[PDB]
Amino acid sequence: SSPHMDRLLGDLKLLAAYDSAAGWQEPKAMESAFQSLSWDDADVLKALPQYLNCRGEQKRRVDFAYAALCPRPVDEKDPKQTLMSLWMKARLFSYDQKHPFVLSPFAA
Amino acid sequence: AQLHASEGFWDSESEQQEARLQRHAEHRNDLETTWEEALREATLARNFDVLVSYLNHGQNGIPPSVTWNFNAMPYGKENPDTKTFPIPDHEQPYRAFSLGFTANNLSGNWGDYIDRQDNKNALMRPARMMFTDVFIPTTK
Amino acid sequence: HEQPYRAFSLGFTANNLSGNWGDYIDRQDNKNALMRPARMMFTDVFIPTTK
Amino acid sequence: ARYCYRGLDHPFTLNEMKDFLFKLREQYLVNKYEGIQFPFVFRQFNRVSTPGTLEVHTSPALQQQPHFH
Amino acid sequence: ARYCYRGLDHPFTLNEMKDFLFKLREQYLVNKYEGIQFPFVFRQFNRVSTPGTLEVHTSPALQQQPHFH
Amino acid sequence: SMDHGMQYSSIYWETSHRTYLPFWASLTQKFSWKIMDDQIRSFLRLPKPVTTEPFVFSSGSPYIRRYFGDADISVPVPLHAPAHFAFVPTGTVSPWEETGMETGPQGAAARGAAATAFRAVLESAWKCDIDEQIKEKLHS
Amino acid sequence: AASTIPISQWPSLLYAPPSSPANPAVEALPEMQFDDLHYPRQMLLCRGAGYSLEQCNRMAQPDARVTPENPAEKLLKEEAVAAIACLSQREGGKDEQCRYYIERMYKLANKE
Amino acid sequence: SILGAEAFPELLSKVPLNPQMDEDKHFNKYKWGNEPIPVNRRTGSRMNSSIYDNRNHEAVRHPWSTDARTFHPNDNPEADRINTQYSNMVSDSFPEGGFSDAPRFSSNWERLLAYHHGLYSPEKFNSTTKTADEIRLAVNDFAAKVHADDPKNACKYLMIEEFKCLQSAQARIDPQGAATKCVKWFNEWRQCAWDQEKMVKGYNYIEDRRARKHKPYIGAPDLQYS
Amino acid sequence: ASPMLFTD
Numbered sequence A: 001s002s003p004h005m006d007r008l009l010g011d012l013k014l015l016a017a018y019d020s021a022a023g024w025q026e027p028k029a030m031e032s033a034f035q036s037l038s039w040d041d042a043d044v045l046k047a048l049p050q051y052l053n054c055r056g057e058q059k060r061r062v063d064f065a066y067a068a069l070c071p072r073p074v075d076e077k078d079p080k081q082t083l084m085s086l087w088m089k090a091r092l093f094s095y096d097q098k099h100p101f102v103l104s105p106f107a108a
Numbered sequence B: 001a002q003l004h005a006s007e008g009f010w011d012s013e014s015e016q017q018e019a020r021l022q023r024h025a026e027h028r029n030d031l032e033t034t035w036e037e038a039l040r041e042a043t044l045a046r047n048f049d050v051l052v053s054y055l056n057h058g059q060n061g062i063p064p065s066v067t068w069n070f071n072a073m074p075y076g077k078e079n080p081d082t083k084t085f086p087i088p089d090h091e092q093p094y095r096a097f098s099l100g101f102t103a104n105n106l107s108g109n110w111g112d113y114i115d116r117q118d119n120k121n122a123l124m125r126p127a128r129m130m131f132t133d134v135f136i137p138t139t140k
Numbered sequence C: 001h002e003q004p005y006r007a008f009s010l011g012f013t014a015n016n017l018s019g020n021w022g023d024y025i026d027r028q029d030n031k032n033a034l035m036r037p038a039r040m041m042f043t044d045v046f047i048p049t050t051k
Numbered sequence D, E: 001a002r003y004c005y006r007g008l009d010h011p012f013t014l015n016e017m018k019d020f021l022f023k024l025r026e027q028y029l030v031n032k033y034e035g036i037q038f039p040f041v042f043r044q045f046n047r048v049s050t051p052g053t054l055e056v057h058t059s060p061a062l063q064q065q066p067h068f069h
Numbered sequence F: 001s002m003d004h005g006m007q008y009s010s011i012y013w014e015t016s017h018r019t020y021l022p023f024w025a026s027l028t029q030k031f032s033w034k035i036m037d038d039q040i041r042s043f044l045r046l047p048k049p050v051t052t053e054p055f056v057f058s059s060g061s062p063y064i065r066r067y068f069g070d071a072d073i074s075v076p077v078p079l080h081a082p083a084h085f086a087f088v089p090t091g092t093v094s095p096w097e098e099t100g101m102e103t104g105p106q107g108a109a110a111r112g113a114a115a116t117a118f119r120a121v122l123e124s125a126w127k128c129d130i131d132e133q134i135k136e137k138l139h140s
Numbered sequence G: 001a002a003s004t005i006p007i008s009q010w011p012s013l014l015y016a017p018p019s020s021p022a023n024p025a026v027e028a029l030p031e032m033q034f035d036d037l038h039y040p041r042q043m044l045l046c047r048g049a050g051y052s053l054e055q056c057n058r059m060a061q062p063d064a065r066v067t068p069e070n071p072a073e074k075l076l077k078e079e080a081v082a083a084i085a086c087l088s089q090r091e092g093g094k095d096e097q098c099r100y101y102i103e104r105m106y107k108l109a110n111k112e
Numbered sequence H: 001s002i003l004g005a006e007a008f009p010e011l012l013s014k015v016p017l018n019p020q021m022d023e024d025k026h027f028n029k030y031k032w033g034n035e036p037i038p039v040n041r042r043t044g045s046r047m048n049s050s051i052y053d054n055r056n057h058e059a060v061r062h063p064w065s066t067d068a069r070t071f072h073p074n075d076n077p078e079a080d081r082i083n084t085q086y087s088n089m090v091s092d093s094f095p096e097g098g099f100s101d102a103p104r105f106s107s108n109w110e111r112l113l114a115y116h117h118g119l120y121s122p123e124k125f126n127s128t129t130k131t132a133d134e135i136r137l138a139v140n141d142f143a144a145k146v147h148a149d150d151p152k153n154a155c156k157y158l159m160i161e162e163f164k165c166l167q168s169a170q171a172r173i174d175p176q177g178a179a180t181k182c183v184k185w186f187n188e189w190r191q192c193a194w195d196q197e198k199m200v201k202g203y204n205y206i207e208d209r210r211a212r213k214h215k216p217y218i219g220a221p222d223l224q225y226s
Numbered sequence I: 001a002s003p004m005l006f007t008d
């Protein structure tokens, strides 16, 4: 009854697992993670092309959140990393366009 | 001797106190962590029975009230902590006697097995080598 | 060309290459383990400890 | 010699008891630590085992204890 | 030799600075404590002053430190 | 228990190590030309070093030389009582207090923008879920 | 083979890490930034200018000085979308069902 | 209504987040297995280090009661340390979760007094180790600020390097140990400051004539140095 | 890159 939260936390765990398996030289584990990285979400799939064409304040919010979560720059040559990054950004974009983010500590 | 070591008999008072402090600190940390957890759970549930139930989440016996060690036992030829009544001379033992033109055992005192002392006096301790037929030096 | 040199001593009678005495702070025994118990035998004079 | 041939039911005083326990402790330490020597047990031997690169350093100064005045 | 005749404004590295301060500390200790010897300063001399009744005891065993397992 | 210590290490000379001292070394003695050079300079009116002048021109701030019984032994000492400045406001920091636990802007900033952004993302996702629940509840 | 890195070589380990199956952009590691002072500084500047808290919160904007975006997201757009479709349809590419698109992207990006 | 259905893909698909979880849950997807990080390296207390300290290898004493079991650095590491990333390297010298010597003050004035006397800082006691990404973010922000301060400065990269080394050595939780590593870059920065000042303000000296034995051997080349 | 990452 909390699919958004559940899938967010799962994707984060899977990113961490991919990083750990890369550090420990484990192709089997990292491919297992990549396969388990929730690719069958219609909402994120529909938001993907919207994020690929967004611009301005919404894009800046989403990029700020994605830098908060995953600040390390992925290699511009690794399509798996690129795709996981795109998927996470699309998920954040969906969450934002449903209910925008409030990133400032000052708020009321 | 190994049994004594289990009970901490060969340990010093400092070591006994440190072990006691270590137990105290471990227990304190466990208690405070358990309190934090119990309070968090009872706050998210808004119920006092959860706090009550967290009172039995961790009782073999108790820590010893007092401890006794080997260094607490007194020793000394002159130390009055060992003298209750005078021991008769016909029961006290004799010291070895050696006297000759070549060597003796009266120009010095080596002490007891525990409380030992240098047999040579201060002026000739730097020249101990000169009072020996053989001398095997230290390793340094 | 700016690092300093270590002293050199070599002869039929003595040398300073069979061992290392270390620096002024980090010192080490020049004799190896097998002959440390027989250090007296590698000296012309020996003044023992006071104990 | 004191108990079985002289008739003393209490042969050892406090000093002798301490000496016995001291020797017992030394036996334990000698059989526990291989090569233990004088500073900890009354024993000296020349043929010792050293690491091979023996470093020599000055000991630290004695700990400053707090005192009045 | 390095500053005034070779032109180096920074002659001492960290190691040389530490060595200088070590020697300074040893000078201080030598002039402060009369007769201080090797274990605390790199120095040995034979003609030492002893009390007159020198007691010899075994050192205490090394302090048991708490450890896991 | 540090003064008047015993000889802890052995003193020895290794076989055939050189000494570099002749038999008249004890009669030998050192010498420096510095005293004679100073006398000669003073008598011939040769160039003096600037250390003879107490005022120091080697910096912008005023320094005066303090001499230890001779012009050759001096140390410069600053005269100014320097005024220091702080472009800082008062009462804006309480370091003893852990601020990551208190709720507020100062708390979030003692924490970071990353934690705040993560909290906001969780907030948005939770709001999505709760909006779905509200819809399915009120449609009934 | 992989020997221990002492603590003195960690600063170089941070900006020249060892090779891994998933490496970062070492040439861009000095460009990864995330300012924790962004909003505090923004608020301070606005309040010094003379605005109120509400005006400051309305004028606040998220930081643009963050880690740059991957140029692949703009150059390999269509190939990435196709790969993501393949994954969504084939359960994440199990038993090599999106090798086609993944290899096309890898070739385009690497060029031997 | 079950809690957390779509939130444990690691459990549904046997994906281990680390070799420890792999070994525990018996997923067996790590070809090289797992060498457990012992408890003395997972947690522990701050210890004295110098051999010129009498209480060396002993826990640091605080005003509050503290578990004296110390963190033991990895002194005899295995030859193969497959993961040579900062994540796996930092565990040989610090515990990721921080030391176990943090206080729970019964009152606020005890905290105040400890801080006032220099025996407590939350930055030092209630905190974990910094991750490589955090270290890099901090270093890059500091570098940007220094460059903005002065681009035409020679000691800029030296200051950046001392900052970097402090961050890498975790000076927040081991300030003394980290200063022991970064004082060298501090000294280099000091030297560079003097050098820049003497180049700005023309400061030179009368060099003496060349020595009669400047060259040790006539056939040796006398490489000229500025 | 920075001049301090160079070692050779």
Ligand SMILES: CCCCCCCCCCCCCCCCCC(=O)OC[C@H](COP(=O)([O-])OCC(O)COP(=O)([O-])OC[C@@H](COC(=O)CCCCCCCCCCCCCCCCC)OC(=O)CCCCCCCCCCCCCCCCC)OC(=O)CCCCCCCCCCCCCCCCC
Residues within 6 Å of the ligand: B098, B099, B100, B101, B102, B103
């Ligand atoms: C409460 C109140 C209490 C109060 C106190 C009370 C006291 C208690 C109660 C007392 C009651 C009273 C009791 C009486 C007193 C007790 C006394 C007692 O018991 O003694 C204990 C006490 C010893 O007790 P201890 O506990 O064992 O002490 C530690 C040891 O002694 C440590 O030993 P060491 O390591 O020092 O080694 C010593 C070494 C010492 O060894 C030597 O000194 C020998 C050196 C010889 C060198 C030359 C040899 C040449 C021969 C060559 C032979 C041919 C070649 C063969 C080759 C191989 C042989 C070399 O060994 C010996 O001692 C050997 C002794 C046995 C041999 C004796 C030989 C006697 C020959 C006599 C010849 C007479 C000639 C008369 C001619 C007159 C002139 C016309 O006595 C001593 O002091 C010991 C030393 C004694 C001195 C002996 C010296 C003999 C030297 C003879 C040389 C002859 C040359 C002549 C040349 C002149 C003509 C040209």
Ligand SMILES: CCCCCCCCCCCCCCCCCC(=O)OC[C@H](COP(=O)([O-])OCC(O)COP(=O)([O-])OC[C@@H](COC(=O)CCCCCCCCCCCCCCCCC)OC(=O)CCCCCCCCCCCCCCCCC)OC(=O)CCCCCCCCCCCCCCCCC
Residues within 6 Å of the ligand: C009, C010, C011, C012, C013, C014, F015, F016, F017, F018
């Ligand atoms: C990166 C790559 C690097 C690679 C490596 C590169 C290396 C560097 C570059 C190398 C470039 C190449 C340069 C060339 C190589 C350098 C070599 C060098 O410089 O040497 C350094 C090196 C030494 O440098 P060091 O740093 O000072 O080393 C530590 C000291 O040496 C430690 O000193 P010590 O504590 O061990 O004491 C030693 C002691 C040693 O003292 C003794 O050995 C003398 C003992 C004499 C006992 C008998 C004397 C009887 C006389 C009685 C007189 C009448 C009575 C008067 C009474 C008072 C006098 C006793 O003192 C002396 O040495 C005295 C030397 C001065 C006198 C020389 C006398 C020469 C006479 C020759 C006679 C010729 C006769 C021919 C007849 C032929 C047969 C028909 O050389 C040595 O190895 C030193 C030992 C040299 C051996 C000399 C032995 C002479 C013995 C003569 C006995 C005559 C008896 C004949 C009997 C047969 C007929 C019956």
Ligand SMILES: CCCCCCCCCCCCCCCCCC(=O)OC[C@H](COP(=O)([O-])OCC(O)COP(=O)([O-])OC[C@@H](COC(=O)CCCCCCCCCCCCCCCCC)OC(=O)CCCCCCCCCCCCCCCCC)OC(=O)CCCCCCCCCCCCCCCCC
Residues within 6 Å of the ligand: F017, F018, F019, F020, F021, F022, F023
């Ligand atoms: C087998 C190999 C053959 C092939 C050879 C291969 C080698 C070829 C190359 C040559 C070797 C080069 C090797 C490199 C050498 C580097 C190492 C080195 O040299 O130094 C190491 C070595 C290291 O020592 P160190 O610890 O580093 O100290 C270094 C110091 O700089 C120096 O230490 P120091 O200064 O302490 O030592 C000097 C010493 C010796 O210095 C001298 O004596 C100066 C030399 C004067 C010689 C002429 C006087 C002779 C008088 C003889 C008359 C005696 C009575 C007649 C009796 C006849 C019946 C027996 O001084 C003393 O010990 C005390 C004497 C003080 C008085 C001297 C002045 C007065 C002289 C007149 C006497 C008046 C007495 C009056 C008393 C008062 C009355 C009121 O240096 C020495 O040992 C220096 C002395 C060496 C003497 C060796 C003894 C053997 C000499 C014979 C040699 C062979 C002779 C051959 C036949 C020719 C003679 C017939």
Ligand SMILES: CCCCCCCCCCCCO[C@@H]1O[C@H](CO)[C@@H](O[C@H]2O[C@H](CO)[C@@H](O)[C@H](O)[C@H]2O)[C@H](O)[C@H]1O
Residues within 6 Å of the ligand: B099, B104, B106, B107, B108, B119, B120, B121, B122, E052, E053
């Ligand atoms: C039966 C008597 C006739 C036979 C004589 C036998 C030999 C005599 C022994 C040597 C006499 C001199 O002995 C010398 O003085 C005393 C002896 O206790 C020792 O001195 C030592 O013990 C005395 C205790 O009284 C201390 O006060 C002194 O501080 C200490 O140095 C010396 O170490 C020794 O060198």
Ligand SMILES: CCCCCCCCCCCCO[C@@H]1O[C@H](CO)[C@@H](O[C@H]2O[C@H](CO)[C@@H](O)[C@H](O)[C@H]2O)[C@H](O)[C@H]1O
Residues within 6 Å of the ligand: C010, C015, C017, C018, C019, C030, C031, C032, C033, D052, D053
């Ligand atoms: C110019 C070359 C020709 C002239 C030769 C001059 C004399 C040669 C010196 C003696 C050679 C043997 O030297 C012997 O081996 C080495 C020398 O470093 C020493 O060995 C010691 O140093 C070595 C360092 O390499 C350690 O590995 C070893 O654990 C330690 O014991 C011994 O203490 C010495 O006894």
Ligand SMILES: CCCCCCCCCCCCO[C@@H]1O[C@H](CO)[C@@H](O[C@H]2O[C@H](CO)[C@@H](O)[C@H](O)[C@H]2O)[C@H](O)[C@H]1O
Residues within 6 Å of the ligand: H209, H210, H211, H212
């Ligand atoms: C009672 C009678 C007394 C008689 C007195 C006789 C006085 C004679 C004094 C001559 C002193 C010469 O001293 C020496 O000379 C040469 C050139 O001449 C100097 O010069 C030499 O060294 C310096 C640098 O090292 C340079 O000038 C140059 O490389 C070289 O020429 C030396 O620096 C100086 O040390």
